[PDB]
Design an enzyme around this catalytic site. Structure first.
Site, PDB file in Angstrom:
ATOM      1  N   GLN A  11      -8.706   8.299   1.054  1.00 49.61           N
ATOM      2  CA  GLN A  11      -9.284   7.526   2.148  1.00 49.61           C
ATOM      3  C   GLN A  11     -10.146   6.384   1.626  1.00 49.61           C
ATOM      4  O   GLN A  11     -10.020   5.246   2.088  1.00 49.61           O
ATOM      5  CB  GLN A  11     -10.093   8.439   3.066  1.00 49.61           C
ATOM      6  CG  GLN A  11     -10.449   7.805   4.398  1.00 49.61           C
ATOM      7  CD  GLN A  11     -11.611   8.491   5.082  1.00 49.61           C
ATOM      8  OE1 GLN A  11     -12.646   7.879   5.329  1.00 49.61           O
ATOM      9  NE2 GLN A  11     -11.444   9.772   5.384  1.00 49.61           N
ATOM     10  N   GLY A 135     -10.583  15.819  -2.583  1.00 53.54           N
ATOM     11  CA  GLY A 135      -9.458  16.577  -3.085  1.00 53.54           C
ATOM     12  C   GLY A 135      -8.254  15.726  -3.425  1.00 53.54           C
ATOM     13  O   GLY A 135      -7.871  15.620  -4.594  1.00 53.54           O
ATOM     14  N   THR A 136      -7.647  15.115  -2.404  1.00 61.18           N
ATOM     15  CA  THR A 136      -6.428  14.350  -2.627  1.00 61.18           C
ATOM     16  C   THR A 136      -6.667  13.164  -3.552  1.00 61.18           C
ATOM     17  O   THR A 136      -5.863  12.929  -4.455  1.00 61.18           O
ATOM     18  CB  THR A 136      -5.826  13.886  -1.297  1.00 61.18           C
ATOM     19  OG1 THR A 136      -4.657  13.097  -1.553  1.00 61.18           O
ATOM     20  CG2 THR A 136      -6.816  13.067  -0.488  1.00 61.18           C
ATOM     21  N   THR A 170     -22.147  13.394   0.545  1.00 59.09           N
ATOM     22  CA  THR A 170     -21.514  13.676   1.826  1.00 59.09           C
ATOM     23  C   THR A 170     -20.900  15.066   1.874  1.00 59.09           C
ATOM     24  O   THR A 170     -20.950  15.716   2.920  1.00 59.09           O
ATOM     25  CB  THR A 170     -20.448  12.617   2.124  1.00 59.09           C
ATOM     26  OG1 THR A 170     -21.047  11.317   2.086  1.00 59.09           O
ATOM     27  CG2 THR A 170     -19.836  12.839   3.493  1.00 59.09           C
ATOM     28  N   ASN A 219     -17.285  -2.273   0.659  1.00 62.50           N
ATOM     29  CA  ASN A 219     -15.942  -2.571   0.179  1.00 62.50           C
ATOM     30  C   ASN A 219     -15.732  -4.064  -0.019  1.00 62.50           C
ATOM     31  O   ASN A 219     -14.965  -4.466  -0.899  1.00 62.50           O
ATOM     32  CB  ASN A 219     -14.913  -2.001   1.152  1.00 62.50           C
ATOM     33  CG  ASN A 219     -15.068  -0.513   1.350  1.00 62.50           C
ATOM     34  OD1 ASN A 219     -15.187   0.247   0.392  1.00 62.50           O
ATOM     35  ND2 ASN A 219     -15.077  -0.085   2.606  1.00 62.50           N
ATOM     36  N   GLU A 245      -7.128  -8.254 -23.315  1.00 69.70           N
ATOM     37  CA  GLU A 245      -8.249  -8.602 -24.184  1.00 69.70           C
ATOM     38  C   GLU A 245      -9.538  -7.925 -23.753  1.00 69.70           C
ATOM     39  O   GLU A 245     -10.585  -8.570 -23.659  1.00 69.70           O
ATOM     40  CB  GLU A 245      -8.428 -10.117 -24.223  1.00 69.70           C
ATOM     41  CG  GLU A 245      -7.261 -10.875 -24.837  1.00 69.70           C
ATOM     42  CD  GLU A 245      -7.454 -12.379 -24.788  1.00 69.70           C
ATOM     43  OE1 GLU A 245      -6.504 -13.119 -25.118  1.00 69.70           O
ATOM     44  OE2 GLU A 245      -8.564 -12.824 -24.420  1.00 69.70           O
TER      45      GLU A 245
HETATM   46  N1  LIG Z   1     -17.549   3.268  -1.454  1.00 72.41           N
HETATM   47  C1  LIG Z   1     -16.911   4.009  -0.555  1.00 72.41           C
HETATM   48  N2  LIG Z   1     -16.829   5.375  -0.722  1.00 72.41           N
HETATM   49  C2  LIG Z   1     -16.184   6.141   0.191  1.00 72.41           C
HETATM   50  C3  LIG Z   1     -15.598   5.557   1.299  1.00 72.41           C
HETATM   51  N3  LIG Z   1     -15.029   6.531   2.034  1.00 72.41           N
HETATM   52  C4  LIG Z   1     -15.237   7.717   1.415  1.00 72.41           C
HETATM   53  N4  LIG Z   1     -15.961   7.493   0.274  1.00 72.41           N
HETATM   54  C5  LIG Z   1     -16.394   8.508  -0.701  1.00 72.41           C
HETATM   55  O1  LIG Z   1     -15.363   9.453  -0.903  1.00 72.41           O
HETATM   56  C6  LIG Z   1     -15.899  10.752  -1.066  1.00 72.41           C
HETATM   57  C7  LIG Z   1     -14.944  11.808  -0.522  1.00 72.41           C
HETATM   58  O2  LIG Z   1     -13.604  11.432  -0.741  1.00 72.41           O
HETATM   59  P1  LIG Z   1     -12.790  10.661   0.411  1.00 72.41           P
HETATM   60  O3  LIG Z   1     -12.231   9.362  -0.114  1.00 72.41           O
HETATM   61  O4  LIG Z   1     -13.692  10.410   1.596  1.00 72.41           O
HETATM   62  O5  LIG Z   1     -11.608  11.660   0.840  1.00 72.41           O
HETATM   63  P2  LIG Z   1     -10.297  11.797  -0.075  1.00 72.41           P
HETATM   64  O6  LIG Z   1     -10.496  11.100  -1.400  1.00 72.41           O
HETATM   65  O7  LIG Z   1      -9.120  11.218   0.663  1.00 72.41           O
HETATM   66  O8  LIG Z   1     -10.095  13.377  -0.294  1.00 72.41           O
HETATM   67  P3  LIG Z   1      -9.790  14.351   0.949  1.00 72.41           P
HETATM   68  O9  LIG Z   1     -11.100  14.844   1.504  1.00 72.41           O
HETATM   69  O10 LIG Z   1      -8.974  15.523   0.471  1.00 72.41           O
HETATM   70  O11 LIG Z   1      -9.034  13.610   2.028  1.00 72.41           O
HETATM   71  C8  LIG Z   1     -17.218  10.746  -0.319  1.00 72.41           C
HETATM   72  O12 LIG Z   1     -18.199  11.427  -1.063  1.00 72.41           O
HETATM   73  C9  LIG Z   1     -17.592   9.286  -0.174  1.00 72.41           C
HETATM   74  O13 LIG Z   1     -18.735   9.001  -0.946  1.00 72.41           O
HETATM   75  C10 LIG Z   1     -15.675   4.181   1.473  1.00 72.41           C
HETATM   76  O14 LIG Z   1     -15.160   3.655   2.453  1.00 72.41           O
HETATM   77  N5  LIG Z   1     -16.334   3.408   0.544  1.00 72.41           N
HETATM   78 MG   LIG Z   2      -9.089  12.315   3.504  1.00 70.75          MG
END
Ligand SMILES: Nc1nc2c(ncn2[C@@H]2O[C@H](COP(=O)(O)OP(=O)(O)OP(=O)(O)O)[C@@H](O)[C@H]2O)c(=O)[nH]1
Ligand SMILES: [Mg+2]
Ligand SMILES: Nc1nc2c(ncn2[C@@H]2O[C@H](COP(=O)(O)OP(=O)(O)O)[C@@H](O)[C@H]2O)c(=O)[nH]1
Ligand SMILES: Nc1nc2c(ncn2[C@@H]2O[C@H](COP(=O)(O)OP(=O)(O)O)[C@@H](O)[C@H]2O)c(=O)[nH]1
Lengths: 430, 44, 430, 430
Positions: A11, A135-136, A170, A219, A245
């Site tokens: 995500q 996770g993912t 989070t 972002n 480089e």
């Molecule tokens: N900088 C930034 N960090 C994010 C954002 N969205 C989620 N995160 C970070 O991602 C962490 C959790 O992973 P996510 O990307 O939200 O979820 P995921 O990587 O898809 O893993 P799943 O929970 O299995 O779906 C959180 O602790 C957030 O700090 C974002 O839009 N910008």
């Molecule tokens: Mg997710």
């Protein structure tokens, strides 16, 4: 004849990919429909007549974000069948996305990667984005990196990972998968850049004067950093720098490739034009500890090598006159075995502004990528957080029941201990 | 800019298929029926 | 000159022909009333290949339609382009076979076949220079698989030097519509190998898979499968009706694709195939055509071509294109896949170019490859046959019309011998 | 995709569902006739989570209603939105249980459950990708607490990898409506811990306390308690039906809130809740939501959360808001209350944001926290159970239907062991 492929998984990865892909389309004049109303070739490909297709692939097991992408204004831009989507989310479980559901999806992603690579003729390398505390994201990033390292070999891969903040978090289980993913990408990625959210929140609050930021504001800054890094490949410049480089200039040893970034200037249009934004003051602001893009204190450690990019109307002599001033200061000290540590790049194209965004239009900017010995603190604090819960084996049953072995947690701990010992061994003077 | 909070305000404000023989006019694939017979790669 | 006549039998063959002739008529600009309304001069130069000339300037196909029941031909006449067929060529019985091979080959098919052979002889004796015959029929039905194969032997006995084509649909075990399919499939394969100069297997399961995965249309029907089969059928003889850089009649393909006289069972595929929504995204180039041409899912058979090694391959490009690109791409598709090509015959890919593309498309490719992977279909057919025959199930229906079990034993033994000697060359090394 | 089916049993569960489905239908704009009349596009994108599609364009819930007496389902049908339920899913007996657990679990509930399991299997086998099941039932009744819990085991035996939710109302000693409540509460808790993946306790006493103190309405009725429970139920799965900044399905909450497999008994609460006369005074801000969210009187259980320490906590914010404020407030609520948070697991609060608020409200929060203070409920239940059992009062009713006192002794021992091992971690230190 120079190309690069960006991989977005999870995500956070998809939400920062959207942020960078408005910026690139805006910077190259391409409308959201993909139609123009020879620099595009680095990120795009020509279809023969009309539209351009990004050299990017979006990955996720949870379909909501991809469905949001496929209905927004950018529905016509991306190729319909490179937005690979799953059905079941990994739910913050690392073992799920590395052993259970990611394996059935990884083959399609690798097929897409091959189909995109056969089109490129001068492939510079890969870019990958993934939020580590999920996770993912972490699991699929690890699996993709491991497959690519053997399918292609010596091609360079760059990772813009977002580690968790020191205290702000989070989830509750993110140290486990953060440590495991660091284990996985320690021996598999050529460059890793630190991106924790707390430092960027402080940057927005102090400079942009926004008291209620959202993820989009973060972002956009990350997208600007990416654009500054890759500008030298698609614009004319007096002192060019290529992706290949880097390991010859920022990576003293194969194990040490985690570095933290900074950007300057960051200022709003309401008070930007009242001051001249000289090169000296922006290069001073870039080295300020409070403007680090990761919440680490550079005053707590030595520097190893600094690679810092300029763009705009900057003149090399003014750059040298400012590098001398920084070498003069007593609060910034370099490691003993590195007499000169600066690599300088100069580009002519000024940074582009996104309408409705936060940053204003300026003629000079600086982006630094600096490798320092102080980075060991984040590893130490993540290790301390991990040990507290691993002492009582908490939350382990959620991982053992997804095919992972019991001993897999210990060896990641041993590799982190080895990395921390290595960082201490390097920083001592001869 | 003289002590503006408008920026803060703006954030508040936001709160039997036949597709083989029938490729779309837009697409690259579509060659006009009338021109279907120029047979020379050389001149073209 | 060098024209061929069309003969079809059974319901499946009649439905295939009902679309094949529509496709041919649309290609040559012939209205459903038999009146030419084409645009290009080349549309009439070689119309004698498939169409005859009658008084009044209208054209009539030289097709012969046969079945043991009148329903299917009484239905095809009311369809579009149904008036082109000469009423004299319609021959039918009043009883039918009931999917019983014995009835359609010994008792009922033997008495009726004299009338259809009379009109077949009338058509062949008259024509300028015969090239050969092409046969469409199904192996899953009784009357078709019996009468068609006996007619094959009768035609071969009278014209031993002409060429003979057969497009045969074999019953797959996945989509089964008749319980007695293995018996009349095994009995038919026995006779088909002895007389047919070329055979092309087509499976309904592979057609459904293609329609669901590549075209991605929601509700496939027999009209789409017939259209794909018709396009594949037309692609083979295109250069015999139009000028080109390297003309290649059917006999030239027979020389170059059949190493030994008993190995003449090919599987085919057609490219390009794209969905309606993605027909604008794709750009038609020779690499794009050749990558889809050798794709495993693109084959018109469920047989997996990477489970064996190609003995030889053929490609019939359409449209105006450079020959150097075609040759280099054919070389590249053979260097990168050396493991799947037999090594004791070098340069085992044949290419041909025709300057007239299909109506509505700028480039098209028809692929005909002789591979060792076809053994799997005969293996499963024989497996079902021997599972059903060991209990003598449904045997009395066949044995009540003069047939015996000895002809079943000989057919099984010959089919197994074919299976064995077809794979004998797969393990052969130089 | 990733949808769930609804199963409810008993009178209390049927009354809870009769308002839960009304709330869901009002949220998605579905009229009581099954016709969509909504305003926003997002109202239909993920409607497959709870609703099926039938001919004529109307929608039908995938709910299964079961009871041992026909009165309650004959009454719920005449209520508003009662026509949505499919008549085929109504299964009932002719005898009833009479608040006797043995009758509803051994003699009568065993024979009837085959029919309801048939329709349950029909519903689950058909659906696109199963996420899991959610169960609403009461522990104070015989037929409910027996048949529901036996159905839990039967479902778990057939779908071991899916997730299972249970919203369970336990009998409080303050407002007691049945004298035999301790027996069937203690017997049910024994089976519920072994099979349910998640359990959420709800007490009528806490609902009356909330209605009298926070909403300050004069005459509470079961409709208000049902409405509060329904809002809390809907809040959990909101982000699975709507886009958001950080989507988090039920499995992700399961990973992050359950440290050990036997500690899955949560207590919940909903915010904001304000009186009619004070709904204009208050201003909805994130601090105002989070201060009410952690308020002790706001919990849906009489258990006092400052009598123990939270193992972990979760919050599901709704509406469009900045993430930085949410994270900083979560950090602040954890720094100012360090005494009530267990110290050997750092960062034990999970947060999620969904951009779609409830109809009529601009912001809303659902709180799910796993705390050690829940031991007090099992303590008092076991105290009443052992006070009544020592004299063998009302025991003959249970022992006359094949049950014995040994199953009572084992249930008491297992419940006491659960009570002990749940508080074992309260005194644990690092
Ligand atoms: N900088 C930034 N960090 C994010 C954002 N969205 C989620 N995160 C970070 O991602 C962490 C959790 O992973 P996510 O990307 O939200 O979820 P995921 O990587 O898809 O893993 P799943 O929970 O299995 O779906 C959180 O602790 C957030 O700090 C974002 O839009 N910008
Ligand atoms: Mg997710
Ligand atoms: N492609 C295609 N196949 C068909 C059609 N109709 C029937 N078939 C196939 O033909 C098989 C049955 O053959 P059958 O009609 O009994 O042949 P017959 O005995 O000669 O009449 C079935 O397994 C179908 O898969 C059609 O319209 N198109
Ligand atoms: N929230 C709510 N609780 C109810 C309602 N009706 C009954 N109850 C509770 O359910 C308990 C009795 O359960 P019971 O009806 O015997 O369950 P059954 O045996 O399965 O039918 C009482 O203690 C009530 O507090 C209702 O409409 N709403």
């Amino acid at each position: 004849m120079r190309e690069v492929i960006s991989i977005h998984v999870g995500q956070g990865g998809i939400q920062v990919g959207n942020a960078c892909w408005e910026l690139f389309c805006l910077e190259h004049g391409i409308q959201p429909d993909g139609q123009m109303p020879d620099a595009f070739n680095t990120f795009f490909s020509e279809t023969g007549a009309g539209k351009h297709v990004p050299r990017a692939v979006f990955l996720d097991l949870e379909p909501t974000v991809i469905d949001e992408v496929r209905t927004g204004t950018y529905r016509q831009l991306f190729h319909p069948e490179q937005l690979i989507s799953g059905k079941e989310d990994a739910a913050n479980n690392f073992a799920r996305g590395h052993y259970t559901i990611g394996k059935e999806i990884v083959d399609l992603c690798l097929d897409r990667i091959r189909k995109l690579a056969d089109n490129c003729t001068g492939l510079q390398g890969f870019l990958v984005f993934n939020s580590v505390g999920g996770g993912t994201g972490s699991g699929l990033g690890s699996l993709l990196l491991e497959r690519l390292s053997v399918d292609y070999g010596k091609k360079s891969k760059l990772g813009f990972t977002i580690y968790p903040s020191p205290q702000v978090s989070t989830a509750v289980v993110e140290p486990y998968n953060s440590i495991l993913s660091t284990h996985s990408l320690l021996e598999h990625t050529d460059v890793a850049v630190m991106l924790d959210n707390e430092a960027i929140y402080d940057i927005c609050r102090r400079n942009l004067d926004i008291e209620r930021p959202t993820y989009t504001n973060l972002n956009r800054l990350i997208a600007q950093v990416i654009s500054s890094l890759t500008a030298s490949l698609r614009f004319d410049g007096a002192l060019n720098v290529d992706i290949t480089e880097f390991q010859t200039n920022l990576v003293p040893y194969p194990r040490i490739h985690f570095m933290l970034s900074s950007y300057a200037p960051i200022i709003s249009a309401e008070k930007a034009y009242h001051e001249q934004l000289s090169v000296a003051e922006i290069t001073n602001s870039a080295f300020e500890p409070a403007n680090m893009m990761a919440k680490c204190d550079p005053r707590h450690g030595k520097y190893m090598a600094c690679s810092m990019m300029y763009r705009g109307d900057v003149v090399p002599k003014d750059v040298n006159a400012s590098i001398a001033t920084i070498k003069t200061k007593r609060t910034i000290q370099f490691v003993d075995w590195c007499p000169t540590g600066f690599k300088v790049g100069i580009n002519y194209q000024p940074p582009t502004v996104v309408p409705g965004g936060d940053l204003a239009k300026v003629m000079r900017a600086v982006c630094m990528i600096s490798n320092s010995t102080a980075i060991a603190e984040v590893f130490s604090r993540l290790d301390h957080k991990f040990d507290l819960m691993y002492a009582k084996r908490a939350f382990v049953h959620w991982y053992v029941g997804e095919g992972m072995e019991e001993g897999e947690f210990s060896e990641a701990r041993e590799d982190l201990a080895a990395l921390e010992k290595d960082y201490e061994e390097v920083g001592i003077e001869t | 800019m003289k002590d503006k909070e408008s920026i803060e305000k703006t954030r508040i404000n936001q709160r039997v298929k036949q597709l083989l023989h029938n490729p779309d006019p837009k697409s690259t694939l579509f060659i006009p029926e009338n021109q279907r017979f120029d047979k020379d790669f050389s001149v073209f | 000159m060098r024209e061929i006549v069309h003969i079809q039998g059974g319901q499946c063959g009649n439905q295939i022909g009902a679309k094949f002739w529509e496709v041919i008529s649309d290609e040559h600009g012939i209205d459903p009333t038999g009146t030419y309304h084409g645009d290009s001069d080349l549309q009439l130069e070689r119309i004698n290949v498939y169409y005859n000339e009658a008084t009044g300037g209208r054209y009539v196909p030289r097709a012969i339609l046969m079945d043991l029941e009148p329903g299917t031909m009484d239905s095809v006449r009311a369809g579009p382009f149904g008036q082109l067929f000469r009423p004299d060529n319609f021959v039918f019985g009043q009883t039918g076979a009931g999917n019983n091979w014995a009835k359609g080959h010994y008792t009922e098919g033997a008495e009726l076949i004299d009338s259809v052979l009379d009109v077949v002889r009338k058509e062949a004796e008259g024509c300028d220079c015969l090239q050969g015959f092409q046969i469409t029929h199904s192996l899953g039905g009784g009357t078709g698989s019996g009468m068609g194969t006996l007619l094959i032997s009768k035609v071969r006995e009278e014209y031993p030097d002409r060429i003979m084509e057969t497009f045969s649909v074999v019953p797959s075990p996945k989509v089964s519509d008749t319980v007695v399919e293995p018996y009349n499939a095994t009995l038919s394969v026995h006779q088909l190998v002895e007389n047919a100069d070329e055979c092309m297997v087509i499976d309904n399961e592979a057609l459904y898979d293609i329609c669901f995965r590549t075209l991605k249309l929601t509700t496939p029907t027999y009209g789409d499968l017939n259209h794909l089969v018709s396009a594949a059928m037309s692609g083979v003889t295109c250069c015999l009706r139009f000028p080109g850089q390297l003309n290649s009649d059917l006999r030239k393909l027979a020389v170059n694709l059949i190493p030994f006289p008993r190995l003449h069972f090919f599987m085919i595929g057609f490219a390009p195939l794209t969905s309606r929504g993605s027909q604008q995204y794709r750009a038609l180039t020779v690499p794009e055509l050749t990558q889809q041409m050798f794709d495993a899912k693109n084959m018109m058979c469920a047989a997996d071509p990477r489970h064996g090694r190609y003995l030889t391959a053929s490609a019939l490009f359409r449209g105006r294109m450079s020959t150097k690109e075609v040759d280099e791409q054919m070389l590249n598709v053979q260097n990168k896949n050396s493991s799947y090509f037999v090594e004791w015959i070098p340069n085992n890919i044949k290419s041909s170019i025709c300057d007239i593309p299909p109506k509505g498309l700028k480039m098209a490719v028809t692929f005909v490859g002789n591979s060792t992977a076809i053994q799997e279909m005969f293996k499963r057919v024989a497996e079902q046959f021997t599972a059903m025959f060991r209990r003598k199930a449904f045997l009395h229906w066949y044995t009540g019309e003069g047939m015996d079990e000895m002809e079943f034993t000989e057919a099984e033994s010959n089919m197994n011998d074919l299976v064995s000697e077809y794979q004998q060359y797969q393990d052969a090394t130089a």
